[PDB]
Subunit: 155 residues, 3 copies
Amino acid sequence: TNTLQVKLLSKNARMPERNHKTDAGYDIFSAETVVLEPQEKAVIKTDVAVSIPEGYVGLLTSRSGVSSKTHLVIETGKINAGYHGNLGINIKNDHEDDKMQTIFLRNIDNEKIFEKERHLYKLGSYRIEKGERIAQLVIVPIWTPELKQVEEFES
Amino acid sequence: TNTLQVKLLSKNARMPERNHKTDAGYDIFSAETVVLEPQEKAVIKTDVAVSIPEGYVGLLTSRSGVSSKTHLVIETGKINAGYHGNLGINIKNDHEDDKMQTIFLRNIDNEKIFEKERHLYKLGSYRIEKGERIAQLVIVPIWTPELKQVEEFES
Amino acid sequence: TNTLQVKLLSKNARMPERNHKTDAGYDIFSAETVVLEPQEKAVIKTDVAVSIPEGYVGLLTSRSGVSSKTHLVIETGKINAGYHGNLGINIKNDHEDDKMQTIFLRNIDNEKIFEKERHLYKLGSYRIEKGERIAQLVIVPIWTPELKQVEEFES
Ligand SMILES: O=c1ccn([C@H]2C[C@H](O)[C@@H](COP(=O)(O)NP(=O)(O)OP(=O)(O)O)O2)c(=O)[nH]1
Ligand SMILES: O=c1ccn([C@H]2C[C@H](O)[C@@H](COP(=O)(O)NP(=O)(O)OP(=O)(O)O)O2)c(=O)[nH]1
Ligand SMILES: O=c1ccn([C@H]2C[C@H](O)[C@@H](COP(=O)(O)NP(=O)(O)OP(=O)(O)O)O2)c(=O)[nH]1
Ligand code: NI
Ligand code: NI
């Protein structure tokens, strides 16, 4: 009743966490490791499925720490009450494509990642790693009345 | 009561649709045909008016299919309970302006549109056509208490 | 009960305003004066703190007038029920960095600001001034049930 059904779709999926009763949302973890170049768009698999009951909508939205620090822009997803598919993260690396190149990409804390092997990445490239806090899920009640075409409003 | 008032403002306006009782929102259709160049901003007319009752807010928000596939970024609009004006779609083609040009623009499914007449468009240009599913409306309850200036919080 | 606690953190902070009972949100004012260059990111201090009660989330979101007219993109912040810190505005000037320069920057109405002293700014630069309407706060009820790992959903 006052419980939400969560299903893991793979071994790479992590269970959402609401560590504090103070918090409004549930920590969503990536089930993928991907490198996003400037201007590049992607849908990140969480390998998690939720069964939101009717009368509610789920908001798969961005964290403030990742969005303020990095150019990673997450378009909030509206999780329909009944959708049992894989929760994707609609993401875009909004860093501009200035043609410049660097020897290291940066994490979701905007910090430079030092590698043992030298590699040439385009400047402004980010990497998201398996099991990282990149999004959060917030469930909000909704009002869905029947629509009535009207020629001029009540008042 | 448990009905929402909808008004069409022209012949080009289409009635919002909630085809499934599973869905949280209402399909919003464009009343315009416009071509958006890279970095170009616009407010798309739906020619639709809604009368949301007090204690609720409307969220004129993006669809997941259009936002994940195209560079079309819709800034979610907060529809105030009482606003009876034309619902606009605050949109931006976030494709970068790389000065390059192509012989065809692309639709809201990111597919290339083949034309009988050759025309030169800038690379990353999109066209939205009259009567297309580009946005959705989600109504959510709101808490609007009176504000009290406080020197230090309750607890 | 049906009141919200608001705390000012400095002399530069302004009290949020819900001028109409028609409106869904509360007008949020900047406590800073900053110039944002193209592609530049910042967190704007409001010097305001709110004590949202449990069972609710706050949405520190963009105004339609500023977002449709300017390239100022505000990533909606989810204000947790219990957070008593400074409300920041997660902002980005999404104007592209075209290397061009102009003798005047522009305001949150996208109008050119004429100065007595000539200065060279990069094209697409915006200035936000102390005490300006740049954001709004909308509080929405939330459902936070306990999570139960499930192998296959109820129905
Ligand atoms: O724009 C913002 C966003 C967040 N905040 C505050 C409110 C919130 O309680 C706190 C945490 O931000 P979020 O709830 O949006 N994300 P999260 O709880 O995951 O924190 P973080 O992103 O830092 O891990 O920061 C702002 O003041 N302005
Ligand atoms: O980022 C997202 C967005 C949506 N989804 C899922 C949840 C939702 O039930 C389903 C449909 O997405 P939206 O409700 O956000 N838009 P719409 O119902 O119109 O579908 P589409 O945009 O594909 O027409 O896709 C994700 O998993 N991640
Ligand atoms: O995309 C939008 C955004 C807003 N609107 C309408 C609905 C709303 O009642 C009205 C005001 O917009 P917002 O509530 O989103 N922001 P605000 O009340 O502060 O007005 P403004 O931003 O113009 O000061 O404009 C649209 O039609 N489409
Ligand atoms: Ni939102
Ligand atoms: Ni951009």
